[PDB]
Amino acid sequence: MASLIQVRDLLALRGRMEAAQISQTLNTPQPMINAMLQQLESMGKAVRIQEEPDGCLSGSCKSCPEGKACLREWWALR
Numbered sequence: 001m002a003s004l005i006q007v008r009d010l011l012a013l014r015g016r017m018e019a020a021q022i023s024q025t026l027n028t029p030q031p032m033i034n035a036m037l038q039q040l041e042s043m044g045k046a047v048r049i050q051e052e053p054d055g056c057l058s059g060s061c062k063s064c065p066e067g068k069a070c071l072r073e074w075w076a077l078r
Helices: 004-013 019-025 030-043
Strands: 046-049 074-077
Touching (some): 004 074, 030 046
Antiparallel strands (some): 046 074
């Protein structure tokens, strides 16, 4: 495995960015940085970031989804 300083440094260097990116930086497995991010989050080191919302068009009618996953939440430092 890699070091946390990597994700932390990258998080600082590359600022706010998804883990997918960080993981790539260290060619690490997706299901690796997320775990760390969770730990840091619990502690209160990094912060959660949100990406642009979603939208759609529609004439005269109403219909929403069923919750569905949330936007691609990004991660950053505090």
